[model samples]
Target: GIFFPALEQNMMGAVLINENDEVMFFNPAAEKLWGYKREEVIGNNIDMLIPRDLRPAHPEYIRHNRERELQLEKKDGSKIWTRFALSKVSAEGKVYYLALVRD
Candidate 1:
């Protein structure tokens, strides 16, 4: 579950991933920005949203709490420039990563 209900209404894109790098939560803002329906992205690996060129070099765990500027792939196979912030949260020994992004 996405611990924060407010994230659903946030203007910035919010994506939550689990320790295995699978998407656990995808918010509406993210769906709009990435041109993907909520069901399309949910349960997929983070690789689905990463640009093809960069996926080869992407790290397993992005540096937490760092603000980054990068490209995210859209459902149409196009890329969008974005600025995003990554954060790590732990609950009952499970690790989760939250990405907050804007175009």
Candidate 2:
């Protein structure tokens, strides 16, 4: 309710996900960029944003391309090009992923 809006209005897509690829936080710009609502994304596998064309070996692809630019899915089943950088961060001692996305 407080600090989130400040980041939400910015140009970048800041996302926080769990180790299992479940989205924990999806900034407004990111939701706009990916064409999925924040509510729709949370608690769902982050891979939902990965292109369906790449669904095969999705796990291996994500694991290997953790910090690389990759094509993700948009609502219409098209792709969005992104320079994705992944980081391991913790909240209250639990591990999570803070992925910085640049278009």
Candidate 3:
């Protein structure tokens, strides 16, 4: 609670997904940038945020921990090129993928 507010209030969007690719944490900045509400995104698969054309090969980048600009399909079905970075975290007996995103 003490340190996590830093993430929740970050200017850059922050999303945390489980090993199964389900979104566990999505910050306000992420919600705004993605045009999705926190309730709509949480518990959903990370694939929903990617453009359909990129979905086929999206997993490879995650596996490789690659970071770059990519197309993000918004909640209204519009697309935008956004930049993001990926990091791996292992905590509390679980593995999670964290994405730091921005326009």
Candidate 4:
């Protein structure tokens, strides 16, 4: 499929989350980047992206970011790095999270 092949070969990661913080979309680039697949991640909590050790406190951290914002790390134990930026979009009184990932 065009989406799968493109995402598999691409160097960028892309994800989409609903207002409830559940992952609604995860591209193949993300699967390759994190060694995980959309089937394993989509419909799961965004906290799944964080390493297990860091997960316990993630809820509080996310809450803290409600006023400002926060940066998070990936789970894979690799030296390779990436950065994340988050923005909110409001439509019909609901907010969605748009996460932009970069290397």
Candidate 5:
């Protein structure tokens, strides 16, 4: 298993999720914007990173579209506007949602 997606250098946030909206992976760029480390956020739900006002609709929106540009919340109580694209990724027969977020 020598294959891996290179860490992106575009200052973008990379988040991978499962069917239930749980984060399976959190990249370094996502950590920087979120003010969190991989250990803290990995295997956790995405609720903490979403704004209270948008939480209700965000999940369905992303789930329904698999892609969109929206305003995401940051850990420092700030905002990050990004274009999020989610795709299906497979490793060892399991499926995961890969989201690439860019400004």
Candidate 6:
């Protein structure tokens, strides 16, 4: 029950990704932040939020971060001030990434 009950009704965008970089959860705030609905984002690649040219290198960056446990950034693209943070969470022997984003 790793829930964000306190934030469930808040206005900050949040997304959860598994170790493989697949989106597992997206909150309503995320919908507002990216102009997409929960249904449209869940089960999709997290890279979809990134600009196209930078997408190809996303997986490699994830792999490297998982190995080194460091932070990463998406290259500057069409949008100028988007920021994101990814933290590792372990539950039921599975590793998950909690991504908090801001525009």
- Which runs of model 5 end up more than 4 angstroms from their true locations? 5-11, 62-67, 90-95
**Tens digit of lDDT per residue, candidate 5, span 14-87?**
88877667887788888876778878877788776678798898788767764487787777778877788768
Which runs of model 2 end up more than 4 angstroms from their true locations? 1-6, 61-67
Q: Best TM-score goes to which candidate?
A: 3
| Model 3, global lDDT | 0.87
Kindly list the per-residue Cα lDDT of model 1 for residues 1-103, writing each as its tens digit.
Answer: 6647789889999999987778999999999889988899888888888877777766533634223888788888888889999888887787788899999
Q: Pick the candidate with the highest lDDT.
A: 3
RMSD of each: 3.6, 3.2, 2.7, 4.6, 3.2, 4.8
Backbone collision tally, model 5? 0
Error of 1 at 9 (Å): 0.4
Q: Mark the regions of model 3 whose C-alpha exceeds 4 Å error after superposition.
A: 60-67
What is the TM-score of candidate 1?
0.84
True-structure Cα RMSD, model 6: 4.8
Candidate 2 per-residue lDDT, tens place, 1-103, comes to: 8677766676778888776778888888788779988999999997787678676787785577555878877988767788887788867766687777878
Candidate 5 vs. true structure, TM-score: 0.72
Would you give me the overall lDDT of model 1?
Answer: 0.83
Residue pair clashes in candidate 2: none
TM-scores for all predictions? 0.84, 0.75, 0.85, 0.68, 0.72, 0.75
User: How many backbone clashes can be found in candidate 4?
Assistant: 0
In candidate 6, what are the lDDT values of residues 1-103, reduced to their tens digit?
A: 4356755655656888886778888888767666677888788888876667667887787788778222333333334355676688888788888877666
